[PDB]
């Protein structure tokens, strides 16, 4: 260190940019008293937020309902769990034509979950590992070399090396003893318990950083790419490679929420720039490893979970590489819907018992409330069930009136062999199982 | 089988259960696992009807068939879906049964002393619930995660005398005079 | 075969009680799904509770404002546009 | 939810019937049946064949 004490610099200013330092009043480009490795002001990566994120403001958004705009309360009633921000949020949603229509209040459980770095790291450290090309990490093994397995000269009396069968890792034609094979690389098991937290503490971070933008509809006039750059030009997004991109969680309109992206936008979202259409969700199914110990001795695979989070869910990497986040309300409906039963199960019991009083457990299956709004893909499945509940009328396995004789059924053990045979009106009905 | 209060057939021994209609229960946790279970049976029908929409023309040639082999879908409907309806129905009864009792309790109780105190006798209003539901009302604790912004502790963060700079491009720029940092020992 | 694959088609275009079709029985429960067209607006947006608005007049039983959309008419299937009229744009549109 | 109808249940192992299923000290569910119907021999059994069906 501190070597090269000379010759590293030219004693001459480049007649272009180079410039002396005038005085203390001189505002130097780039200078700032905090150690920032991404020195971005509000003109380079300008935040799409009502106010600039200030230490005073708990969050750079409408903490209150502003009077000159339709306010849309949350799809679901709201409760403030352990980590949430205890501060109301109101994010104005943007018309496609860059106008600001009605403002919408966000869920303080998904977008109110305050960040703490070491619990998004469990998300990032997962992505920076799950996103290797594991199968590329092959390497030749000692046995896999195809050389003579027999010492050509047995070392007896002269000064030859104590070596033979030179297919080991010392020689320039060898291979390792414990090499790196894919089936020896661990793909980490990632729980939904912490993927959800590790997604909510980011999509809040992208809200506290004021990079959160809600759009009514992410739809194009036509599926051509040019219409998607023209859309970005009106909305001001910077999908250039260098200008910070945009992360679209396409969920569809406010009234037509859908998981499968708007076919118009999907084909138009294929620009070479920096953008990544992710799926509108934060959960992912429980991990499982069917080849847990060694069961399948031929799998190529990594070790660990055999159900990795796909590449296009919302992760930590593509959440911090893309400055702005672009969520349609059709996703907010899905995120509040998919995390509702999760948000409720985490409240302490002396709270959980207060919900049906305050109107949180209105269960449309019992009919105490008309059914809430559903994803088009799920309402299309809900309507399927409502049409089918009549095919189960005459039978007995009807999954809506399970065991409808259990009233009049009378049981009677039989002392000849151990059984308990139910009778209904003296008539035996217990189906003696087949082995 | 049990799974509801009817008593499993293991009341072969004629074990009666007297002193009944005794408890008003709001079915809090059960309505939760109902909304969880009702989501599954709908999240299952969505799967049982997945039908090829191949947005690509490479393998478009199946765009009419279901996404599951006819024998499998004919199974998954019967193995997992129709199971999940029974599991949904079970909660749809353990609650519709418990309500029937509450409907009887909330009448015989409303009379005796007050129709005002009644829904207080049957309440669960813990003094802190303002912490979880309407946190704007809650003061008696400081339960923000960003505690240094609680109104009783806002006086921690400094209010910088900021300013804009049109010569720099409308950049906001704090007018604090930086304190000369420590340097040597 | 054009019968079995038809006798059973008609039973799914209409013969639902209601599932996105089912013009026979009544409105499916998801027709009455609580949709909030705007703060304080639910199914009509013309007055207040347009279904319940005509329930004020004698039209309680004969006026339905919910879009029981089984009854809705389906638009004609959209097909590929006609080829372009200028060879320059005629073959370039075959390069999209 | 996988058994649509009552598929008959076999009585537990003999060791269980000795200790729990039929033992009134635990109020086992057969402590009613055992005394009512089982513990009585056949109406024809003598002294040696009190255990044959």
């Amino acid at each position: 260190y501190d070597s090269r004490s000379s010759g590293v610099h030219d004693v001459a200013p480049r007649d272009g940019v180079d410039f002396m330092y005038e005085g203390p009043q001189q505002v130097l480009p780039g200078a700032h008293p905090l150690p920032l490795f991404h020195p971005d002001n509000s003109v380079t990566r300008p935040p799409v937020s009502p106010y600039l994120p200030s230490p005073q403001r708990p969050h750079p958004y409408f903490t209150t309902e502003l009077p000159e705009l339709p306010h849309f309360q949350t799809t679901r009633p709201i409760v403030y769990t352990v980590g949430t921000m205890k501060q109301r949020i109101v994010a104005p949603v943007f018309d496609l034509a860059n106008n600001v229509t009605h403002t919408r209040e966000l869920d303080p459980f998904i977008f109110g979950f305050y960040p703490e770095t070491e619990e998004m790291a469990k998300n990032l450290s997962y992505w920076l590992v799950r996103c290797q090309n594991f199968s590329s990490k092959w390497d030749y093994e000692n046995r896999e070399i195809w050389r003579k397995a027999k010492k050509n000269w047995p070392n007896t009396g002269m000064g030859m090396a104590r070596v033979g069968d030179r297919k080991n890792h010392a020689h320039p034609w060898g291979a390792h003893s414990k090499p790196v094979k894919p089936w020896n690389l661990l793909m980490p098991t990632m729980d939904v318990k912490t993927w959800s937290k590790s997604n909510r503490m980011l999509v809040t971070l992208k809200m506290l950083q004021g990079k959160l933008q809600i759009v009514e509809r992410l739809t194009l006039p036509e599926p051509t790419q040019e219409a998607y750059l023209q859309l970005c030009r009106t909305m001001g997004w910077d999908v250039r490679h260098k200008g910070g991109g945009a992360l679209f969680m396409d969920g569809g309109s406010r009234l037509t929420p859908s998981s499968e992206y708007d076919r118009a936008f999907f084909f138009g979202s294929f620009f070479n720039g920096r953008n990544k259409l992710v799926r509108p969700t934060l959960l992912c199914d429980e991990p499982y490893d069917y080849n847990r110990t060694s069961s399948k001795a031929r799998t190529k695979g990594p070790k660990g979970q055999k159900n990795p989070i796909p590449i296009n869910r919302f992760n930590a990497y593509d959440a911090l590489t893309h400055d702005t986040l672009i969520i349609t309300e059709g996703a907010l409906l899905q995120l509040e819907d998919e995390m509702y039963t999760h948000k409720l199960a985490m409240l302490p019991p002396h709270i959980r018992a207060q919900l049906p009083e305050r109107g949180f457990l209105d269960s449309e299956v019992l009919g105490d409330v008309p059914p809430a709004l559903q994803t088009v893909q799920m309402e299309a499945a809900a309507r399927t069930e409502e049409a089918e509940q009549a095919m189960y009328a005459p039978y007995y396995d009807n999954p809506y009136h399970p065991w409808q004789d259990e009233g009049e059924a009378s049981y009677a053990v039989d002392a000849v062999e151990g059984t308990v045979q139910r009778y209904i009106k003296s008539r035996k009905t217990s189906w003696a199982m087949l082995s | 089988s049990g799974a509801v209060g009817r008593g499993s057939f293991h009341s072969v021994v004629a074990g009666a259960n007297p002193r009944r209609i005794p408890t008003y229960y709001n079915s809090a946790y059960e309505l939760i696992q109902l909304h969880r279970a009702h989501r599954e049976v709908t999240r299952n029908f969505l799967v049982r009807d997945k039908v090829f929409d191949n947005k690509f023309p490479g393998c478009s040639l199946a765009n009419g068939l279901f996404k599951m082999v006819p024998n499998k879908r004919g199974n998954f409907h019967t193995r997992e879906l129709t199971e999940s309806i029974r599991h949904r129905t079970i909660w749809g009864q353990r609650i519709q049964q418990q309500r029937t009792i509450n409907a009887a309790i909330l009448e015989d109780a409303t009379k005796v002393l007050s129709p005002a105190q009644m829904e207080d006798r049957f309440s669960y209003r813990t003094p802190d619930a303002a912490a979880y539901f309407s946190p704007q009302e809650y003061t008696a604790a400081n339960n923000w995660p960003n505690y240094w912004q609680h109104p009783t502790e806002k006086h921690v963060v400094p209010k910088p005398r900021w300013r804009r700079e049109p010569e720099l491009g409308g950049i906001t720029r704090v007018r604090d005079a930086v304190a000369t940092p420590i340097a040597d020992y | 075969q054009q019968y079995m694959a038809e006798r059973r088609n008609v039973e799914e275009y209409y013969k639902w009680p209601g599932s996105s079709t089912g013009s026979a029985e009544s409105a499916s429960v998801y027709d009455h799904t609580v949709v909030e067209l705007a703060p304080g607006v639910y199914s009509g947006h013309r007055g207040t509770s347009a279904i319940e608005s005509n329930c004020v007049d004698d039209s309680n039983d004969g006026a339905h404002g919910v879009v029981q959309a089984a009854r809705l008419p389906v638009p004609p299937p959209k097909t590929r546009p006609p080829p372009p009229r200028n060879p320059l744009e005629h073959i370039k549109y075959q390069q999209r | 939810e996988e058994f649509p109808t009552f598929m008959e249940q076999e009585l537990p192992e003999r060791k269980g019937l000795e200790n729990f299923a039929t033992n009134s000290r635990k109020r086992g569910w057969l402590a009613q049946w055992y005394e009512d119907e089982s513990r009585y021999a056949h109406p024809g059994a003598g002294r040696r064949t009190a255990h044959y069906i």
Binding site: V365, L366, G367, E385, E386, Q389, Y400, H401, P402, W403, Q404, D405, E406, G407, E408, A409, S410, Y411, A412 | G5, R6, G7, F9, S11, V12, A14, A16, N17, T89, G92, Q93, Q96, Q97 | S26, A27, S28, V29, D31, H32 | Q32, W33
Partner: peptide, 22 residues
């Protein structure tokens, strides 16, 4: 051995997917 307690209540529950009225 018949089931005296809650003898009914098997046929009175889970109105499957409440219809247009509710």
């Amino acid at each position: 051995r018949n089931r005296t307690q809650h003898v009914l209540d098997w046929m009175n529950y889970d109105g499957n997917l409440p219809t247009h009225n509710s």
